[PDB]
């Protein structure tokens, strides 16, 4: 109220001596003691389930860390780190200790979900694009997202550093219908070749989209403009 007015937080929440501050979100008040008069402080609070809830606000006021513990303030249940640019990463734990779910959310709304995480890392991988959704697996060395159309399988790999590599395998065995691929890590383009003749280019953009550019009949140069993919069947149709 007075002498602590308010300020908005990363994630649509508010925060308002013997510095002192008081916050409130999720139907109950959280209060603590900060170090400055901007909102840089932790916020303690308790839930009806006797579970301990902790909100850690960074000193730059651009990174909120909301944590949920059991009746003991040590064993955690969920942990959602939200940044200023909406770059969120929420985790959930199986009560064994291991993280069972990890929901990575990017700035442009594209979320990256992981479910069914075993004790080693193998788990269901599902990336939520805009208009369509990709699914795949998770190995301990990369994130693999696969799109299948008959024999052709489009594998979008994601290294743990974050760079994207894409390959293509075809169980076909006909020199006129077999589909090979060519990847360019610099231009981020996958070029599909059929019978020693190029067919189309797929570009994986830094805006987390995919564009399709069909080659001409002679397979020497592109033609027309690129079509941003909106339906999942548009990715399958390019693999036909």
């Amino acid at each position, epitope marked *: 109220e007075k002498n602590s007015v308010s300020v908005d937080l990363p994630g649509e929440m508010k925060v308002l001596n013997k510095y002192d501050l008081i916050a409130t979100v999720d139907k109950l008040e959280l209060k603590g003691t900060s170090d400055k008069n901007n909102g840089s402080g932790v916020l303690e609070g308790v839930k009806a389930d006797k579970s301990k809830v902790k909100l850690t606000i960074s000193d730059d006021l651009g990174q909120t860390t909301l944590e949920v513990f059991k009746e003991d303030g*040590k064993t955690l249940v969920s942990k959602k780190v939200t940044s200023k640019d909406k770059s969120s990463t929420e985790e959930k734990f199986n009560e*064994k200790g291991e993280v069972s779910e990890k929901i990575i959310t990017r700035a442009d709304g594209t979320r990256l979900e992981y479910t069914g995480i075993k004790s080693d890392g193998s788990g269901k991988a599902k990336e939520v694009l805009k208009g369509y959704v990709l699914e795949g697996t998770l190995t301990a060395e990369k994130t693999t997202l696969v799109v299948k159309e008959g024999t052709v399988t489009l594998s979008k790999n994601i290294s743990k550093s974050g760079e994207v590599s894409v390959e293509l395998n075809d169980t076909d065995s006909s020199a006129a219908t077999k589909k090979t691929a060519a990847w360019n890590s610099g231009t981020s383009t996958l070029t599909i070749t059929v019978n020693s003749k190029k067919t189309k280019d797929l570009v994986f953009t830094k805006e987390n989209t995919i564009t399709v550019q069909q080659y001409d009949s002679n397979g020497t140069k592109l033609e027309g403009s690129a079509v941003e993919i909106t339906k999942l069947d548009e990715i399958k149709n390019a693999l036909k």
Partner: antibody
Amino acid sequence: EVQLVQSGAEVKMPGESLKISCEVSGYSFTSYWIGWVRQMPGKGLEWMGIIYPGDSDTRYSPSFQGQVTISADKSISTAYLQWSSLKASDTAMYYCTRSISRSGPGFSLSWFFDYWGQGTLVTVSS
Amino acid sequence: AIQLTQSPSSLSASVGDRVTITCRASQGISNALAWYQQKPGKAPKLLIYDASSLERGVPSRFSGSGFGTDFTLTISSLQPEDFAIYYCQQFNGFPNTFGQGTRVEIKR
């Protein structure tokens, strides 16, 4: 009420076997991990291994893999630290510790220890 | 594994001095650090976990902060019963590693 009671001191010769126990009470024994920490004579702290009695999952530190057996018993709320054969260099004080799990990025987890046992001293000489 | 280096080795301060102890890692362990207090005889006792959160029962004069690779344990108003050895440990990268400790004495 959380208490971790360990076994008594031991005197062993090089080559003999030994199993020390950590009788547990105060909390839900099946919910928390149980670790083991070594303290060489007047020296630092060495973490040996850990056990989760919910499924008897032994995570051995590489410095002690194949050198010591860690077991648990959910029926009696007791953990164990067992040696196949004692060596003269194994003389140290050993602690059983209740552990709090933390998901370290990435693909794994580690723990910190909030409640400790009183310590069991193992002297190995001939 | 991950090596942890503390500072200093020994220390002497009078009752009331704000004493700080450092713990330097070799990697980015941003939040995974714990502080223990081994008193004369036995045994180690958890003081501060997650490098900021204080354990129940531990007096308010004990505090801790840190991020990245540099961390600092801080006693606000030293007390004679606070004479002990203080260890830091990392639990961000398997396996858990401890620091070599830090001795704290009292001047009178």
